[PDB]
């Protein structure tokens, strides 16, 4: 159903990884993946929802459906306790699917004693995503050679968003905040939502009504990622979900991607990862390294600026009007749960090197020419990416 699939997309970066299907041969794959589907990282939203409803209950201020909601919210509070931030069973199955399609699409690459390496951040959901992926690989071919490592040693290339002080200050106190807050006030209409659950929803101040509805949407959007057989998605109409998604999409865009208000600083910080991607591919192309694949497991905050810095079409647009962002930049197409980028390298009969870029396993476009899309000349692509890195260094230098 097109309605339900749109509602799923409106979970934004909480969307589960989309359904994908099986199907020359590459000689190397260069990968970055976000962890799979996870529990919420913060209790603040669930606590806010429960507090509003519990106060209403003590005032006899709940509708029938509001009583049902409170009952569910109390259950979720018990089921989320001790699980915050963790990879769910669905997250593991997402990684098994990505690895499985890779192996079945390119068996010769992972055959015999092929060598692979994987790295992850220190965050457990990313480590455990890497292990779900690797375990799938090893099950299919136990004769793989596998190097596995993880931790803060990879912060410079996988968690660069924590290391640049100017970006940390922008994320925490930058000029995107008043734009976001004004957009939330314009887009979010709380009274229709709160009328479902609360008697006298008009007595609530606009600010607290806004906060409650935002928190409730947050809970409903993450529940499909938890492997728990409960659902809040139907509480809301497609238009209500669309409005919520527009606000969070704008937040993600302005805080982490190519919005003009950010001056490309949120994108420029990713250049060390793009540099390391090029270096690992060049070492394999030359024969200095003989890995068949490099895998990397990290975060949406890794994937989003990395994709923008590559210049994948529709991901580095600099949209002048905040209200227009949702038309031109869609976070659920870039960084859903288990979001991943794969560079597939090919050698043709005349030994020329070609690269295909997959974003969530679909061919991605770059703003350079090729006569055989989706395959790009590696020489042309490397030169383009190196120009992106040089641009990124300049951007960082204009902001200390």
Automatic annotation (TrEMBL):
Is Hydrolase among the key words of this record? yes
What residue range is the signal peptide? none
Listed PANTHER family: MULTIPLE INOSITOL POLYPHOSPHATE PHOSPHATASE 1 (PTHR20963:SF8), MULTIPLE INOSITOL POLYPHOSPHATE PHOSPHATASE-RELATED (PTHR20963)
Species annotation: Bacteroides thetaiotaomicron (strain ATCC 29148 / DSM 2079 / JCM 5827 / CCUG 10774 / NCTC 10582 / VPI-5482 / E50)
| Name under which the protein is recorded | Multiple inositol polyphosphate phosphatase 1
Please list the GO terms describing molecular function.
bisphosphoglycerate 3-phosphatase activity
Where do the annotations place 1D-myo-inositol hexakisphosphate 2 binding? Answer: 13, 34-35, 38, 41, 125, 159, 252, 299-300
Q: Name one Pfam family in it.
A: His_Phos_2
Quote the record's binding site residues for 1D-myo-inositol hexakisphosphate 1: 9, 314, 332
Major subcellular site: membrane
Q: Which domain of life is it from?
A: Bacteria
- Recorded catalytic activity of this chain's protein: 1D-myo-inositol 1,2,4,5,6-pentakisphosphate + H2O = 1D-myo-inositol 1,2,5,6-tetrakisphosphate + phosphate; 1D-myo-inositol 1,2,5,6-tetrakisphosphate + H2O = 1D-myo-inositol 1,2,6-trisphosphate + phosphate; 1D-myo-inositol hexakisphosphate + H2O = 1D-myo-inositol 1,2,4,5,6-pentakisphosphate + phosphate; (2R)-2,3-bisphosphoglycerate + H2O = (2R)-2-phosphoglycerate + phosphate
Has the keyword Repeat been applied to this entry?
no
Similarity field: Belongs to the histidine acid phosphatase family. MINPP1 subfamily.
User: Membrane spanning segments where?
Assistant: none
